[PDB]
Every structure is written in structure tokens, then in C-alpha cells.
Ligand SMILES: CCC[C@H](NCc1c(COP(=O)(O)O)cnc(C)c1O)C(=O)O
């Protein structure tokens with residue numbers, strides 16, 4: 213067992229895909245990354261919303277001032293080449309990461325050129341498919357006036373780490389974070405939805421959350437299924453009182469939340485319908501959505 | 510030209526001191542680092558407050574939940590061995606960095622063991638010794654309720670990057686950041702002092718700043734010199750109206766601020782006295798302080 217990894221145009225062994233410990237990306241949290249799934253349906257391997265993830269990678273890089281010298285098209289091709297070169301025929305999580313490979317102590321990162329690495333890794337479920345127990349954590353989500361939280365920027369994730377570790381140490385599966393204004397915004401690595409009186413609600417972008425591609429997927433799904441949907445701020449009380457709640461994300465997929473700070477919630481019907489639909493979409497069984505699947509072979 | 514670098518007990522070439530691009534330290538800003546100077550006085554090479562920096566490295570790691578399997582003593586010896594092994598006889602900036610060397614997508618970083626790398630690099634002045642022009646930037650310093658800013662934690666520095674880049678792009682030498690409550694707290698990589706009516710003032714730790722070892726040095730210096738000193742919050746207006754102001758830091762040393770957002774300040778007498786004293790201290794000419802100098806040879 214040793215898989216290949218794309219790195220600035222070249223396939224190398226995992227063991228050779230390394231960056232100097234003096235990199236300002238390692239020292240100062242200055243890079244961007246992505247999370248992309250590929251699903252095996254029995255007949256092919258499909259990368260889900262590949263192009264969308266690669267355009268977001270570049271939006272992230274533009275947001276933080278990182279120069280990524282590749283286009284979204286190149287990056288997309290790179291993913292396909294990398295999955296091929298390994299001959300995977302199973303569910304993958306794909307990690308592109310863009311970082312500075314030059315050693316540099318100076319915070320002045322102007323004019324640097326990012327490298328990109330892409331790894332593909334066998335991956336099953338991230339959260340219990342039957343539902344997870346969640347805790348609102350003491351750590352607040354980092355705020356837009358301090359760090360650009362809408363970007364999937366590496367240094368921001370120290371915030372997600374504090375959150376994730378705190379919930380897990382206390383026995384739970386996942387953290388929920390509030391923003392600076394006390395609104396429910398995000399799991400450590402998931403966007404969040406609740407259902408209240410048959411309306412689906414998810415915090416708006418302006419609340420300071422990652423603009424998740426799963427989130428966006430679920431918004432279209434709700435459009436198709438005729439489920440009324442509001443992008444509206446959510447408070448802790450609404451979460452405690454929700455008829456249902458669930459997390460969404462590339463790794464997380466669609467996962468029900470069956471407990472929040474000891475308050476029990478049903479594994480609910482809207483969650484279930486959305487989870488079933490999303491599975492059909494990613495496995496290639498919904499014709500309308502095939503433009504979002506990139507065949508590897 | 511190729512220098513040696515300490516890495517988990519072993520001296521290796523810079524080119525071999527590399528970490529997998531899948532490291533949660535690279536992907537999620539989860540590590541800690543230090544900044545340590547060594548000064549050449551003509552007769553020896555002295556590392557300044559080595560032990561203090563290494564104990565802070567470990568406080569940082571304890572703060573963010575990173576397990577560093579070395580003691581401050583070991584880390585100190587490592588620095589000396591590394592400077593020796595390179596045979597430097599000149600001014601150095603030393604970068605220890607503690608990070609996770611295992612590849613890992615999961616945010617669950619519990620139970621991991623950090624590696625440490627230590628590099629030493631020739632280094633002269635960071636900011637113009639005659640004084641710098643500074644701008645209060647649009648980016649706020651990250652807040653304690655979101656990230657542990659008192660630690661020298663890698664992912665936090667994306668905040669310092671946004672600040673430093675913004676000031677430099679607009680033509681200035683350095684950024685000043687306000688905290689969430691609007692108080693002047695820190696440069697992108699410096700603590701800040703002002704002098705108002707002959708009293709030296711620097712923001713208190715609780716304002717959300719790095720507990721700088723230079724800052725601490727200057728507080729003792731002021732004690733010795735009989736300069737009244739307050740650890741008190743500073744507002745923008747006080748900075749505009751200061752009789753003098755200056756930045757301090759390992760890299761920065763003691764640097765006057767001669768302009769803030771177009772408002773001119775004198776290169777002042779207290780700044781000068783503190784800069785002259787600090788130089789004498791680090792070059793070994795002040796007997797009282799010799800316990801803070803570690804001879805390399
Ligand atoms: C492992 C870190 C989590 C990681 N990010 C997913 C993620 C999301 C949802 O984003 P999307 O639906 O675009 O996947 C929301 N919020 C955060 C903090 C995330 O990490 C993931 O790649 O799934």
C-alpha cells in the first residue's frame with residue numbers, strides 16, 4: 213500500500229508529497245483547501261460537483277490573497293488523472309490543498325506562487341448514518357471582521373479543531389458553534405439545517421459560515437421537492453425546539469441530529485427524504501443531476 | 510549554501526525537513542511556533558531568553574491541545590546544538606515549529622504527538638531602525654472567544670497576514686490592529702508601547718495579545734530605569750496623540766513609530782533609551798542580565 217498524489221503537474225508517491233517546515237503555509241495558516249467526494253455506483257466512479265469545488269478553491273484563494281497558478285479546468289482534470297493513476301473503484305474523499313512551498317519567515321506573502329497537491333483517499337461514513345448527538349460548544353465561530361470565514365482557508369480551521377475536540381472530549385459526535393451574535397451557524401465541519409413547522413431553515417451566508425456545496429445541493433433539492441426553505445438566522449432556542457435538524461457536508465453527507473445538549477429530536481421525515489434523494493443523486497440515479505457527476509472511467 | 514535543521518532529535522539538511530501536505534497542521538492551522546534571536550557580540554554568540562521562549566512554546570501547545578513530547582530543557586539544548594552544527598558566528602533568527610507529521614483528514618487531533626523542527630537563519634533588521642510608518646488596518650485582531658490569541662499558534666497568523674499585507678500594499682511598513690472592543694492592541698508581529706505625559710503604556714494581556722518576551726523585557730527595563738509603566742488599554746485617539754510610540758518583538762527589536770495614519774510622531778527620548786538599553790542587554794554588556802544570554806560556544 214502506497215498511493216499516488218498530484219503535485220504541481222506531476223504524480224508522485226504520498227511519501228514524496230511534502231512541504232518545508234519553514235513554509236509560511238505551515239507557520240502562519242496561509243493556504244486554502246477543498247473536500248470532494250467520488251462515489252462508486254457499481255458501474256462507474258463519479259466525482260460530485262468537481263468543477264464547483266475547484267472554482268470555490270480559487271475563490272478561497274482570491275479571498276485570502278493567495279495566487280493559485282492553475283485554472284478550475286486544470287484542477288478538475290488533475291483530480292480525474294489522480295484517481296485514475298491509483299485505479300480506485302470505491303468511495304473516495306479527495307483533498308486538494310494549495311500552499312506556499314518556498315521557506316519564508318516574513319509575513320509579507322505578496323507575489324508568492326501557490327503549489328497545489330491533490331490526494332485521494334478511500335473513505336466511508338464520517339458521522340453515524342442513524343444520527344449524531346451534538347453539543348453547542350464554548351468556542352464561537354471566528355468572525356468575518358477578523359478572518360475570512362467564508363473561505364476554506366487553512367488557518368481558520370484551528371477554530372474548528374477547538375470546537376470538534378471540545379464536543380468529542382465531552383462524549384458527543386459533533387460540535388455546534390454560535391457566531392459572535394449568538395446565532396447557531398455551523399458544525400465544526402458541516403452546515404446545519406433545521407425544520408420548524410414544516411419549513412426548512414438554514415443560516416444565511418452573512419451569518420459567517422462556509423458557503424457549502426452540499427448546503428447548495430440541499431437548497432436545490434428542496435426546490436425540486438417543493439419543501440419551503442428559508443435562509444434565516446437560527447437561535448439556540450429554535451434548535452432546541454426544532455421538529456428536526458441535520459448536518460450536511462461533503463464528508464458528512466446528510467446526517468440527522470438526534471440530540472442537542474441532551475434535548476432529543478426525532479430522526480425526521482424531511483431529513484430522511486433529503487438523505488435518500490441526495491444518495492440517489494450522487495449514485496447517478498437522477499437524470500436531472502447528471503451534469504454534477506464527473507465519470508472517472 | 511545548505512544549512513542543517515533539527516528535527517525530532519536529528520540534524521538533517523533543510524531540503525530534508527519537510528512535512529506531508531496531508532498534515533492536519535498544514536490543512537487546519539494546528540501547530541505552535543517560536544521566534545528566538547541569537548546575537549553576535551564579537552566574542553560570542555548569545556541566544557536571548559532561550560528558556561523563556563521554549564517554556565512559552567510548551568504553554569502555547571498546552572493552550573491549543575497539542576502534545577509536545579520534549580521538555581523546555583531538551584528544546585533549549587536542541588537550539589544550541591543546531592546553531593553549533595552550522596557554525597554560525599553572526600546574528601540569527603531561530604524558528605522552532607511544532608506540528609503533526611502524520612497525514613490526517615480528521616479534525617479529531619486528540620492523542621497525536623507533535624514533531625518539532627528548529628531552523629536557524631542569518632537575520633539582520635526587520636523594521637527600519639530610524640522608525641516606521643504604521644496604519645491602523647481594517648482587520649480586527651482575532652478574539653479570545655474564537656481562537657486562543659495568547660498562544661503563538663500557527664493558524665492564528667492568517668489574521669496577522671491579512672493585517673501585514675494590507676498595510677504594506679497601501680505603502681506603509683507595518684499594521685496596527687484593534688481588538689473587537691476597538692482598543693489598539695498589536696502590530697502584525699509586534700507588541701506596542703506608547704508614551705503619554707512621561708508614562709509608558711502598553712495594552713494589558715487581557716486585551717487579547719501575544720504575551721511577548723520582548724514586551725516583558727521592556728517592562729523590566731522600565732523598572733530598572735525608573736520609568737513609570739502602566740499595563741492599560743489604549744485607544745486610537747491616544748495613539749494619535751502620543752508623545753512617542755514604538756513596536757517591540759523578537760524580530761522587530763525596539764523600533765520607533767514615526768507616523769501613524771499620516772499623524773507624525775517624534776523619534777522620542779524614552780524609545781531611544783529603551784532601544785539603547787535593550788541592545789546593551791542583548792550584546793552582553795549589562796551584567797545584571799547575563800542570566801538571559803545563552804552562549805553558543
Ligand atoms: C474535514 C473538514 C470538513 C470539510 N468541510 C465541509 C464543511 C462545511 C460543508 O461544506 P461542503 O458541503 O462544501 O463540504 C461547512 N462548514 C465547515 C466548517 C466545513 O468544514 C469537508 O470537506 O467536508
Ligand SMILES: CCC[C@H](NCc1c(COP(=O)(O)O)cnc(C)c1O)C(=O)O
Pocket residue numbers: 317318319543544545669695696697698699700719720721722723724757758759760761
Ligand atoms: C514573524 C512573526 C512575528 C514573531 N512574533 C513576535 C510577535 C510579538 C512580540 O513577541 P516576542 O517579543 O515574544 O517576539 C507580538 N505580537 C505578534 C502578533 C508577534 O508575531 C516574532 O517572532 O518576532
